[PDB]
Every structure is written in structure tokens, then in C-alpha cells.
Amino acid sequence: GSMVKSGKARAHTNIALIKYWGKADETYIIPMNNSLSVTLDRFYTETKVTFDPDFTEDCLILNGNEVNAKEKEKIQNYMNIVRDLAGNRLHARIESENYVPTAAGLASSASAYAALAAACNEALSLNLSDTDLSRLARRGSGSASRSIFGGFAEWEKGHDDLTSYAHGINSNGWEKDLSMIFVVIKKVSSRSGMSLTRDTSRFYQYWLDHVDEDLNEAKEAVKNQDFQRLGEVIEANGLRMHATNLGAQPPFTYLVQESYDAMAIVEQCRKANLPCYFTMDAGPNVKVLVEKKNKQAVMEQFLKVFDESKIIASDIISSGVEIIK
Ligand SMILES: C[C@@](O)(CCOP(=O)(O)OP(=O)(O)O)CC(=O)O
């Protein structure tokens, strides 16, 4: 198509091992602390953008279907950022597929915005650095900043739009030895929940006082390829993030009894020499970090209690966002 510029990208979801939770800046999505994550091989979003001078506004088609006017308006504002960045006024048709178990509660924002950013950079030929790609994705969703990268990644909080972005952490191939089990188990949205907590939680300072120590400990753990050291700090970090919500005004939780059951089975696996550690995000699902060599053994412990359909593993991918057909 002569007057038409398109680009399609595939970006993979990532789970935070050290949590992003609370913004310093609501408009530009600058976080109150750094976060560390691992990018999952099995779950991803494919997003294609097609820019046409004769397009009157941006259109979003998701999983084969028109989105409502609310999502339409939201995506148009985001694309304004893109147009501003490219110095054009081209509108786009955006066709995205989420290969993420969203019905099952898995988040799609990270992969969604990371795929969109990359797709736009490819379509418009902006030649953005990974850094600028991460920055553009961050404007859409904080955790999207990390999905530009594979393996371990860290989002550096910074102090403004220029300085807040993620980068990949080389772990000497360690990500290749690791896996994650997902225990599948309206909700307050991540953005809304973290805002209430950051603004009002009586336990939020306590979170702030320990996160840098956690991050450093975890980073040193990764350098050492020390799984136990990594798991213990990340599990504690996770629980601390949920603690902060308990302190909110008024309190709330994302966890339910079943989540706690899942946690018990992880600790059971530890005492029985199957090392693994758990984490939870903005919902009751429990994610179990385990070494690949133990994925199966640990999975079968869970399959004693939970339906087979609700136990889902993914490996950690080494490569970052990719341009596709
Ligand atoms: C619990 C978390 O998963 C929170 C993620 O929240 P979002 O990345 O969805 O927040 P927004 O920036 O408002 O889009 C922890 C994490 O990924 O660091």
C-alpha cells in the first residue's frame, strides 16, 4: 500500500519479582521505586499498526473485535503521544491479539503496550533505542516498560519522563534454567489500587524503607545465580507489597483463601527439597518461581489439589520484543 506505513510486533508478558507499586507521577507514570522482572516465554501480545493519511481517527480491534468508546478514547490519547514523538498527524488502525490467559486473570498491559510501542517504531521508522522504546511503552503502562526486554530486567525509576525506563540484565544465561508456574485462582485495578495504597496506606513507608535493600539483594542473587537467595527475598518483597494494601484507607486485599492454600503447597515443596518461591500481583493468582529441572515435580504437587486446567507453566524467554509479519 503506497501511502501506508504498517508495523507488527510481538512482546511478551513479564512478572515482577520485585514489585512496582505506587507512582511518584501519575501523568507520566514514574514509579516510587525500581522493580525487577522476568519475561515469560508462553504469554504475549501481537500488535499490528497501520497508519493511513485518510484515516480520520485511531481504531483499535482487539482479539478480532471492536473495542468500546471508552477503550477507543483511551487508545487515541496514547497514540497522540506517538504522533507527537514522530512529528506527524497520522491515525492508525490497530489490530491486536492477546495470547495471554486474560479471562484467567493474567495481566495483558505489559505485553500490550510494549508490543504497541515497538509496532509503532517499526511502522514509522523512528529508530528508537531500546531505552526510548521502554520509555514510550511506560507511558501506556508502567510494567510495559520491562517487556521490551527478555530474561531479567529492571525498571529504573528515574525522576522524570527522560530518566524513567527499563533495561535488560545479563544473567549469564541463568534465565534459561528458570520457570514459572501459574496457579489460576470485579477487582480493584492495579493503577487504582496502587494509587489508594501509595496515597493513604499506613504501611507504605515501611514498604519504601525496604525495597532498595530487596532489589540489591535480589540483583546480587542473580549475579551469583543463587536461586535460594533470590527466592527468599522476592517472596518476602511480594508479601510486603500486599501488606501495604492492608494499611490502605480503607484496607483491601487481592488474596483469597485459595491463594493462601497455594502458598502452603510451595512451602511444603520447600521442606521436601523442591525449592520454589511464590509471588502475587493485582489479583489472587499465585505465581511460583521454580528451577526448570523441578517444574514437573512441583507442578504435580499442585495437581493434587487444583484442577489440571488451572496449573499453567511458562519458561523465561531470553530474547526481547520482536518485529514480526
Ligand atoms: C502488581 C504489579 O503487577 C503492578 C503493575 O501495575 P501496572 O503496570 O498495570 O500499573 P500501571 O502503570 O498503572 O499501568 C507489579 C509490577 O508489575 O511491578
Automatic annotation (TrEMBL):
Q: Which InterPro entries match?
A: GHMP_kinase_C_sf (IPR036554), Mev_decarb (IPR005935), Mev_diP_decarb (IPR029765), MVD-like_N (IPR053859), Mvd1_C (IPR041431), Ribosomal_Su5_D2-typ_SF (IPR020568), Ribsml_uS5_D2-typ_fold_subgr (IPR014721)
EC class (word): lyase
**Gene3D superfamilies xref list:** 3.30.230.10, GHMP kinase, C-terminal domain
Q: Where is the Diphosphomevalonate decarboxylase-like N-terminal domain?
A: 11-166
Q: Which GO terms describe its cellular component?
A: cytosol
- Mvd1 C-terminal domain location is 181-312
Looking up SUPFAM superfamilies in the UniProt record yields: GHMP Kinase, C-terminal domain, Ribosomal protein S5 domain 2-like
The GO terms this record gives for MF are: ATP binding; diphosphomevalonate decarboxylase activity
GO BP annotations of the record are: isopentenyl diphosphate biosynthetic process, mevalonate pathway
Q: Which family does it belong to?
A: Belongs to the diphosphomevalonate decarboxylase family.
In its UniProt entry, what is this protein called? diphosphomevalonate decarboxylase
Which organism does this record belong to? Staphylococcus epidermidis
What phylogenetic lineage does the species belong to?
Answer: Bacteria, Bacillati, Bacillota, Bacilli, Bacillales
